[PDB]
Design a protein around this ligand. Structure first.
Ligand SMILES: [Ca+2]
Length: 568
């Protein structure tokens, strides 16, 4: 990487193939880098779901092949694509879930977009985070979360993998093109959004522009919320699963959640000036809505049943349950362990005859099942907390996860995300958390960050991202000059819901970093406009704390008739 280049033309098939082990003398930043593929790829035409891919060099391999203390093989996989015709920009996409998979690495920009970064002639890279869902699938350690049994695999998942992969990709770019990238960009959602915030705090010089959507920047606390919502909803459950755990998925039918959503709309929709099915004034909604006293606007009666349950009311047990779940977990002293959640119409939604599953899948699960299947009851999120974030890890059969969430002790078990034990020398909050508001180094070198978060996200609370942004603004006056937050009413986790959940985040990110154009609004459209009975709906996303306000005339489904403003 330092020695003279191979005597072949740059940005060519020959320069591409010379990157493979034994085909040249490239020095990688990590001496344990093994290139397994270095292949020239012809241009690929556009498809119904993807933009055309230019002719490029594809490089894939692994870093730091080793054996974990669990006896499993571990390595950091990467896939890199460098177009023959390059715009001089470097791009890394974020992960999802607990990672463990290696994407096509064409540079996803999220927001339901058809275009990839590679389709825009970026050089693009992706990683699996340091473990492999096919290899590190341990049936005694809850499946694909099994990497949590190895301390180094935890560190790789928290920060080290993306650091190693960023360095390797930049080194390959400089060799293949003969020059370093002019600017580097990172875009991720969920776990990928946590990765973006981590990079801005831990490795500020890695990327110049960062998009962090629905960022799990306190991901080790998600399982604490999950135990809380599970125990809060259990009194409203009907029936038991095969292990005797109440069926949390039966606590609310789809029709029940739509009643809740409609009551929220009755209380909150017009607080922004327009009864359009979207709660733009989320702060005013949180101050006004209480399902224990709110009305069902369709029958004019209280949402909470006075007597027996009917299709038009929610039982007092249901109302108590969802209120407690939305309040957030606390210890015996009443101290919050995570954050509270915003009431929003995207908890439900109806398009044709299809009820929105995008909110309820996280805490409740699908209603039509005799087993628990929520992410937070027995699913991936609960499993990840036990094996990946609790220290020491707590492997167990998948049949026992839901019962463990039911017996979760909020004075004892939350401490496990701050603890170390034996060879686990860092806590999960140490290696996975990204809570720092010290972004001076990132800002001072020209870094720009766009955050976004759907209000009806049940994985991570949009209000918790807002609280981080408030802390950032207090710690760094003038923070809006380099970091802005775009909350999306009605939107669920990274996509979906009765809101404008689709948007091109890369175009304004490049404009901010390279031309100094801060995003005063970001255009967005609904992927499911049927939620509003219309063919399309476009709206501006507004920088926190602004919200969209109707101008008073014109099509309510047209972005041009809205502007960003402070709440009324
Ligand atoms: Ca409204």
């Amino acid at each position: 990487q330092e020695p003279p280049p191979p005597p072949v033309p740059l940005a060519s098939r020959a320069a591409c193939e010379a990157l493979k082990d034994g085909n040249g003398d490239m020095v990688w930043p990590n001496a344990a880098t093994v290139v397994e593929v270095a292949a020239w790829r012809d241009a690929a035409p556009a498809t119904a779901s993807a933009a055309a891919l230019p002719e490029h060099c594809e490089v894939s391999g692994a870093i730091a092949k080793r054996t974990g203390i669990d006896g499993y093989p571990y390595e950091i996989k990467f896939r890199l694509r460098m177009p023959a015709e390059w715009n001089g920009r470097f791009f890394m996409e974020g992960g999802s879930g607990t990672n463990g998979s290696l994407s096509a690495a064409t540079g996803s920009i999220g927001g339901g977009q058809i275009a990839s970064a590679l389709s825009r002639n970026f050089a693009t890279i992706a990683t699996d985070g340091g473990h492999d869902n096919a290899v590190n699938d341990n049936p005694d350690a809850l499946g694909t979360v099994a990497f949590g049994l190895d301390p180094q695999a935890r560190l790789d998942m928290g920060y080290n993998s993306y650091d190693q992969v960023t360095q390797a990709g930049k080194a390959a770019v400089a060799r293949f093109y003969g020059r370093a990238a002019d600017k580097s960009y990172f875009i991720g959602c969920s776990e990928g959004g946590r990765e973006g915030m981590m990079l801005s705090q831990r490795f500020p010089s890695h990327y110049d522009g960062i998009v962090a959507g629905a960022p799990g920047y306190q991901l080790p606390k998600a399982g604490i919320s999950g135990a809380w919502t599970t125990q809060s909803l259990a009194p409203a459950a009907v029936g038991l699963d095969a292990q005797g755990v109440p069926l949390i998925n039966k606590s609310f039918s789809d029709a029940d959640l739509h009643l809740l959503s409609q009551a929220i709309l009755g209380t909150c929709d017009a607080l922004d000036g327009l009864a359009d099915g979207i709660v733009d004034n989320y702060r005013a909604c949180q101050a006004a809505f209480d399902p224990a006293t709110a009305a069902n606007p369709a029958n004019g009666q209280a949402l909470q049943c006075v007597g027996a349950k009917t299709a038009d009311c929610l039982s007092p047990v249901q109302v108590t349950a969802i209120k407690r779940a939305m309040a957030g977990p606390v210890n015996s002293a009443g101290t919050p362990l995570y954050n509270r959640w915003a009431w929003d119409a995207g908890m439900s939604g109806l398009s044709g005859t299809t009820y929105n599953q995008g909110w309820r899948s996280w805490w409740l699960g699908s209603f039509n099942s005799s087993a628990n299947n929520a992410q937070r009851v027995s699913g991936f999120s609960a499993r990840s907390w036990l094996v990946d974030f609790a220290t020491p890890p707590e492997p167990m059969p998948m049949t026992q996860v839901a019962a463990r969430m039911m017996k979760f002790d909020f004075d004892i078990d939350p401490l496990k995300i701050w603890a170390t034990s034996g060879q686990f020398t860092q806590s999960s909050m140490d290696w996975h958390g990204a809570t720092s508001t010290d972004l001076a180094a990132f800002r001072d070198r020209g870094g720009k960050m766009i955050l976004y978060h759907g209000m009806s996200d049940a994985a991570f609370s949009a209000l918790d991202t807002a609280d981080y942004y408030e802390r950032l603004g207090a710690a760094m006056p003038g923070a809006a000059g380099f970091a802005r937050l775009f909350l999306v009413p009605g939107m669920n986790h990274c996509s979906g819901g009765p809101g404008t959940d689709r948007f091109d985040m890369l175009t304004p990110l490049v404009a901010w970093v390279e031309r100094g154009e801060a995003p005063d609004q970001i255009s967005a459209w609904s992927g499911t406009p049927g939620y509003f009975g219309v063919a399309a709906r476009t709206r501006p996303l507004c920088p926190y704390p602004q919200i969209a306000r109707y101008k008073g005339s014109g099509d309510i489904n047209t972005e041009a008739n809205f502007a960003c403003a402070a709440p009324p």
